[PDB]
């Protein structure tokens, strides 16, 4: 009765589903829950349904989605309305959006990676849990003079502070229990029994969290939903020690990496000559991270990566970088080369696929905010609208479609 659940191959070198290898023809669609919500809760469910259909037509079989968001709903830089405006109090309209997301994915034979939390601020995240515990809602968001380091030390108290961490983790476990035990109001499935869910993912991008926290939370999640895979959500941006600290645990079933050349200072999209160094970085990142995963004998998915539009065509105009009319020639080549490497690595069972960040669909960065202040698309509200989104008619779509066809062909060869 568990034929449809995604599993780790008994030899550790990939996933299976339906008794056959399973490769990840993936996308990120973290805005799905909010778009699936009814109109009064800020959704656009027909648009969600169309964007899922578009992704199915481009060959996608797997969406990494966000199954959390924290209030209060008067905070900048985050999804609104939140799923969980106060601890243990839910916005049912937004929760129903997650039910519709999962039901629509089921109709298109997709599986979901269910991200249960977020280090970062765009869904409230670990800094919001810290604010709840300390009783101080003034979170030092990393804008103006506030460093990404200052914010990180604030939010990392979630797992590093001896007083705060037990309290924060209690509230987080309460959320995990509530999502794992949700009855889908649309199709009646309890989430922890739904084979549309591929995995429960601890959180997006924990920052140097201790091994003991990964051990404890992964075991909690696995005991809560014993039929499902568990993932750590790591970037794998540092060294092998950091990789092992997150992944070398019985209840972490597979490994991830997130590759962000502009964010890490490797690529300047305003530099007409900057692409070769980004392509070489991506190449070496895939090679090295594939080897780290092999050392643990677990699969690996590059569950985030992306690149800006062609800012270099008009480098003096900041707004030009984010217009949907701006071409994506660097991005398309970057995606195409990463994809072709992944297909070759997957052919030897050294990589399991990828989820580009992120599908924008019908949203556009030039459109007005909805009444909650949201311009929904693939870029969360802590970043410029349109930075990394792949729109429904971008030139990148055909490259994604061809990649997914190539990875499915590989999956079939591996099934013989």
| Angle, CA of 9, 13 and 19, to the nearest 5° | 30
Q: Which two tokens stand for residue 390?
A: 């792949």
Beta-bridged to residue 390, according to DSSP, are: 359
For residues 141 and 184, the answer to whether their CB atoms sit within 8 Å is no
Q: Which two tokens stand for residue 261?
A: 């050349």
CA 201/CA 280 separation, integer angstroms:
29
Residue 277, classified by CB atoms within 10 Å of its CB into exposed (0-12), middle (13-18) or buried (19+), is middle
169 Cα distance to chain centroid: 21
End-to-end Cα distance, the chain: 23
Interacting residues of 111 by C-beta distance below 8 A, sequence separation 6+: 6, 17, 61, 62, 63, 105, 195, 196, 197, 198
To what resolution in angstroms was this structure determined? 1.3
Q: Where are the domains positioned within the chain? A: 1-416
CA 73/CA 92 separation, integer angstroms:
15
Instruction: For 232-267, give one letter per residue: b (16+ CB within 10 A) or e.
Output: bbbbbbeeeebbebbbebebbbbbbbbbbbbbeebb
Beta strands in 79-192 (DSSP E): 111-115
Which H, E and C letters describe 281-330, residue by residue? HHHHHHHHHHHHHHHHCCCEEEEEECCCCCHHHCCCCCHHHHCCCCCCHH
Q: In what order do the strands lie in the sheet with 353-356?
A: 229-231, 197-201, 111-115, 62-66, 24-28, 353-356, 300-305, 255-259
- Which of these, 235, 230, 181, 174, lies nearest to 208 by C-alpha position? 235
Beta strands in 163-299 (DSSP E): 197-201, 229-231, 255-259
- Which of these, 207, 220, 236, lies nearest to 300 by C-alpha position? 236
CA 277/CA 250 separation, integer angstroms:
37
Q: Which two tokens stand for residue 265?
A: 């200072």
Does domain 1-416 fall under CATH 3.20.20.80? My reply is yes
Beta-bridged to residue 359, according to DSSP, are: 390
Largest CA-CA distance found in the chain, in angstroms, rounded = 59
How was this entry determined?
A: X-ray
CA 113/CA 126 separation, integer angstroms:
19
């Amino acid at each position: 009765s568990e034929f449809a659940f995604v599993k780790i191959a008994s030899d550790g070198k990939g996933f299976t589903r339906y008794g056959e290898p399973y490769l990840i023809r993936g996308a990120n669609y973290w805005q799905g829950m909010n778009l699936g919500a009814d109109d009064c809760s800020g959704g656009d469910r027909k648009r969600m349904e169309l964007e899922i259909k578009q992704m199915a037509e481009m060959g996608i079989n797997n969406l990494r989605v966000m199954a959390s968001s924290e209030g209060p709903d008067d905070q900048p830089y985050r999804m609104r309305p939140s799923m969980m405006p106060q601890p243990g109090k839910y916005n049912e309209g937004v929760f129903v959006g997650l039910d519709y997301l999962l039901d629509t994915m089921d109709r298109y034979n997709m599986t979901a990676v269910m991200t249960l939390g977020n280090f970062w601020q765009w869904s409230g995240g670990f800094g919001q849990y810290v604010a709840w515990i300390t009783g101080n809602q003034t979170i030092p968001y990393p804008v103006g003079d506030v460093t990404y380091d200052e914010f990180t030390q604030f939010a990392a108290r979630f797992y590093n502070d001896s007083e705060i961490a037990p309290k924060a983790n209690k509230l987080f476990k309460d959320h995990i229990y509530t999502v794992q035990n949700r009855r889908n109001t649309v199709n009646g499935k309890i989430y922890k029994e739904d084979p549309v869910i591929m995995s429960w993912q601890i959180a997006n991008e924990p920052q140097e969290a201790p091994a003991s926290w990964f051990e404890e939370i992964s075991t909690f999640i696995k005991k809560g939903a014993p039929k499902h895979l568990v993932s750590a959500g790591l970037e794998s941006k540092l060294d092998e020690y950091d990789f092992d600290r997150a992944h070398d645990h019985k209840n972490i079933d597979y490994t991830t990496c997130h590759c962000w050349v502009e964010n890490w200072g490797i690529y300047d999209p305003a530099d007409p000559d900057g692409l070769p160094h980004a392509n070489e970085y991506m190449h070496d990142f895939l090679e090295s991270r594939s080897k780290w995963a092999a050392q643990l004998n677990k699969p690996i998915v590059m569950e985030e990566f992306g690149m800006a539009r062609d800012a270099w065509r008009n480098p003096e105009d900041e707004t030009y970088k984010y217009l949907p009319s701006t071409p994506t020639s660097h991005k398309d080549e970057y995606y195409q080369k990463a994809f072709n490497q992944i297909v070759s690595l997957a052919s030897n069972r050294s990589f399991s696929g990828s989820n580009f960040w992120a599908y924008g669909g019908e949203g556009r960065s030039t459109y007005p905010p909805n009444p909650y202040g949201m311009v929904w698309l693939g870029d969360p509200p802590h970043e410029p609208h349109g930075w990394y989104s792949v729109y429904s008619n971008d030139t990148t779509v055909q490259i994604i479609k061809d990649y997914n066809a190539n990875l499915l062909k590989v999956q079939k060869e591996l099934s013989k």
